[PDB]
Design a protein around this ligand. Structure first.
Ligand SMILES: [Ca+2]
Ligand SMILES: [Ca+2]
Ligand SMILES: [Ca+2]
Ligand SMILES: [Ca+2]
Ligand SMILES: [Zn+2]
Ligand SMILES: [Zn+2]
Lengths: 88, 74, 91
């Protein structure tokens, strides 16, 4: 039930610098995680995806970022939310 | 932006039916004082709804007023 | 964005973690706070708190600590007083 101002600009910059330096495109990541190919991934599928890529981050951080990605709060991170979060 | 806070607040405090209508003062962009006499409280915005800082975490503005504005406090 | 996104943070999880750590490590949270509080006025800035924790080798992160410090600081005064501290750790 707790909420905080999470430094998402720093997590985001850190993530994009990581991907860009690791020869990966974030949409290959999304499409890879989106197995049903309908343009959605659960907050949990997304978190598990990031942690699985072994990007330096923690579960405590990832509940926060997954919260921020899910801009509507319907439990799913869709394609447009994903892009909007990473590419304002 | 972020004036959505001061918009939602004034819009919802307008609903007061008291003779001395519930008073709210804005100290900062995210700080408000609520009530006839009172303390400094944080006010942020999550998605569409406004959130006020309470003990166990954060409370929706409507629930906050329901609990602190007497004309709604059943 | 440049000043933080409002988001769910599992604070209970973190504080429990910290309590287990300190408690079975023969360390009192009081002594920690007093150590960080050099001027002895009962409060420590968010940054002094964060630095204190990161230096203490408690398994956490700076990104976690910005959020945690936000929660500890119930008002927006930029300090964490001992009451905010103890109340946050013992609801
Ligand atoms: Ca899907
Ligand atoms: Ca969504
Ligand atoms: Ca001090
Ligand atoms: Ca404080
Ligand atoms: Zn009223
Ligand atoms: Zn931002």
């Amino acid at each position: 039930g707790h909420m905080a101002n999470f430094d998402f600009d720093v997590w985001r910059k850190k993530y994009m610098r990581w991907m860009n330096h690791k020869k990966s495109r974030v949409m290959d990541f999304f499409r890879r995680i989106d197995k049903d190919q309908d343009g959605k991934i659960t907050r949990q599928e997304f978190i598990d995806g990031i942690l699985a890529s072994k990007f330096p981050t923690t579960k405590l951080e990832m509940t926060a970022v997954a919260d921020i990605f899910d801009r509507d709060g319907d439990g799913y991170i869709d394609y447009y939310e994903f892009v909007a979060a990473l590419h304002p | 932006d972020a004036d959505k806070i001061e918009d939602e607040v004034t819009r919802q405090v307008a609903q007061c039916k008291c003779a001395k209508r519930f008073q709210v003062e804005q100290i900062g962009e995210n700080k408000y004082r609520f009530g006839d006499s009172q303390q400094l409280r944080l006010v942020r915005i999550l998605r569409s709804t406004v959130m006020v800082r309470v003990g166990g975490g954060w409370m929706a503005l409507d629930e906050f007023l329901v609990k602190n504005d007497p004309c709604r406090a059943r």
